[PDB]
Design an enzyme around this catalytic site. Structure first.
Site, short mmCIF file in Angstrom:
data_model
loop_
_atom_site.label_atom_id
_atom_site.label_comp_id
_atom_site.label_asym_id
_atom_site.label_seq_id
_atom_site.Cartn_x
_atom_site.Cartn_y
_atom_site.Cartn_z
N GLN A 257 -44.92 -6.15 88.25
CA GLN A 257 -45.27 -6.22 86.82
C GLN A 257 -44.11 -6.74 85.96
OE1 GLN A 257 -46.08 -1.85 86.65
NE2 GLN A 257 -45.40 -2.06 84.54
N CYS B 37 -49.13 -1.91 84.12
CA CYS B 37 -49.51 -1.02 85.23
C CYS B 37 -51.00 -0.67 85.21
CB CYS B 37 -48.68 0.28 85.20
SG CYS B 37 -48.71 1.12 83.64
N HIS C 84 -48.05 6.22 83.50
CA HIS C 84 -47.97 5.04 84.37
C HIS C 84 -49.27 4.96 85.20
CE1 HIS C 84 -46.53 1.95 86.93
NE2 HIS C 84 -46.22 2.72 87.95
N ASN D 275 -48.16 1.00 94.07
CA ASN D 275 -47.55 0.72 92.77
C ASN D 275 -47.59 -0.78 92.49
OD1 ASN D 275 -46.21 1.39 90.35
ND2 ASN D 275 -44.26 1.94 91.35
C1 LIG Z 1 -47.81 1.77 80.10
N1 LIG Z 1 -48.45 2.93 80.66
C2 LIG Z 1 -49.82 3.01 80.73
O1 LIG Z 1 -50.60 2.15 80.33
O2 LIG Z 1 -50.18 4.18 81.36
C3 LIG Z 1 -51.59 4.41 81.43
C4 LIG Z 1 -51.88 5.02 82.79
O3 LIG Z 1 -53.27 5.39 82.91
C5 LIG Z 1 -53.68 6.28 81.94
C6 LIG Z 1 -54.79 7.10 82.26
C7 LIG Z 1 -55.27 8.03 81.35
C8 LIG Z 1 -54.66 8.10 80.08
N2 LIG Z 1 -55.16 9.07 79.18
C9 LIG Z 1 -54.36 9.45 78.03
C10 LIG Z 1 -54.90 10.73 77.42
N3 LIG Z 1 -56.34 10.68 77.13
C11 LIG Z 1 -56.75 12.01 76.61
C12 LIG Z 1 -58.16 11.93 76.01
O4 LIG Z 1 -57.66 12.21 74.68
C13 LIG Z 1 -56.28 12.22 75.17
C14 LIG Z 1 -57.08 10.38 78.37
C15 LIG Z 1 -56.61 9.04 78.95
C16 LIG Z 1 -53.56 7.30 79.75
C17 LIG Z 1 -53.08 6.34 80.67
C18 LIG Z 1 -51.90 5.46 80.34
N4 LIG Z 1 -52.01 4.73 79.08
C19 LIG Z 1 -51.05 4.88 78.12
O5 LIG Z 1 -50.13 5.69 78.21
C20 LIG Z 1 -51.21 3.97 76.93
C21 LIG Z 1 -50.08 3.55 76.24
C22 LIG Z 1 -50.22 2.67 75.15
C23 LIG Z 1 -51.49 2.21 74.78
F1 LIG Z 1 -51.63 1.35 73.76
C24 LIG Z 1 -52.61 2.59 75.50
C25 LIG Z 1 -52.47 3.48 76.57
#
Ligand SMILES: CNC(=O)O[C@H]1COc2ccc(N3CCN(C4COC4)CC3)cc2[C@@H]1NC(=O)c1ccc(F)cc1
EC number: 3.4.22.27
Length: 219
Positions: free
Chosen positions: A20, A26, A165, A185
């Site tokens: 990436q 990711c 992640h 990963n």
């Molecule tokens: C860069 N990292 C990345 O994308 O990690 C992904 C990995 O997969 C998942 C899987 C589940 C979740 N959940 C968060 C909590 N939510 C509950 C419901 O109400 C709160 C459920 C879904 C989050 C993530 C991550 N997304 C982000 O952190 C993120 C960061 C910036 C953005 F703009 C959009 C997203």
């Protein structure tokens, strides 16, 4: 009864490990890896799908922010809504946000639905990994031990259940008494065990691996 161990790489359902770089894509990698397996199960063809297509095109309407993060579930919803995703070959990964350049001339897969699994349930995750295919999951990767992981079963006492992640569970097993999830990963072949990390399994939802799992299917 589920198999004692699962490895979707042996069933030819997993593409080469991707890299990436500086871009937080990711979530897109996790999403295409889950769909790549379903494409192979349905058609017999193993084809790397375009993570860049998701980065560029599954954006604000899907709560996604390209290189600043996103969700595998809403990535699946984009593929459903869009009626397709391009091959990686046609729409290569550039590790940066670009204009949406989806071209149906290069459509390599479709998605009909996805399923979200219940919070923290490592049993329900095991069932899906055995019976459905690789599962997209989030993990808490914000520890230097994760970045520096090289081999064996990863356990971080400071890990939380709050994910940050996106990765792909492609199997599970036991390594000399330590139960693990086998995780693909997107930090290249240099990371871990040729791009894979074996993460503690049945250790209280370690690093949140079972907090938010999901997987797509193709009609
Ligand atoms: C860069 N990292 C990345 O994308 O990690 C992904 C990995 O997969 C998942 C899987 C589940 C979740 N959940 C968060 C909590 N939510 C509950 C419901 O109400 C709160 C459920 C879904 C989050 C993530 C991550 N997304 C982000 O952190 C993120 C960061 C910036 C953005 F703009 C959009 C997203």
């Amino acid at each position: 009864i589920l198999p004692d161990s699962v490895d979707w790489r042996e069933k030819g359902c997993v593409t080469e490990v991707k890299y990436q770089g500086s871009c937080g894509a990711c979530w897109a990698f996790s999403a295409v890896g889950a769909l790549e397996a379903q494409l192979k199960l349905k058609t017999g063809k193993l084809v790397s799908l375009s993570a860049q297509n998701l980065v560029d095109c599954s954006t604000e309407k899907y709560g996604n922010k390209g290189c600043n993060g996103g969700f595998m579930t809403t990535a699946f919803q984009y593929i459903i809504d869009n009626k397709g995703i391009d091959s990686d070959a046609s729409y290569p990964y550039k590790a940066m946000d670009q204009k949406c350049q989806y071209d149906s001339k290069y459509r390599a897969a479709t998605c009909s639905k996805y399923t979200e699994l219940p919070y923290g349930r490592e049993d329900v995750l095991k069932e899906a990994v055995a019976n459905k295919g690789p599962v997209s999951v989030g993990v808490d990767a914000r520890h230097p031990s994760f970045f520096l992981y090289r081999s064996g079963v990863y356990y971080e006492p400071s890990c939380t259940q709050n994910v940050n992640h996106g990765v792909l569970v492609v199997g599970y097993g036991d390594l000399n008494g330590k139960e693990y999830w086998l995780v693909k990963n997107s930090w290249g072949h240099n990371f871990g065990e040729e791009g894979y990390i074996r993460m503690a399994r049945n250790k209280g939802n370690h690093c949140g691996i079972a907090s938010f799992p999901s997987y797509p299917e193709i009609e």
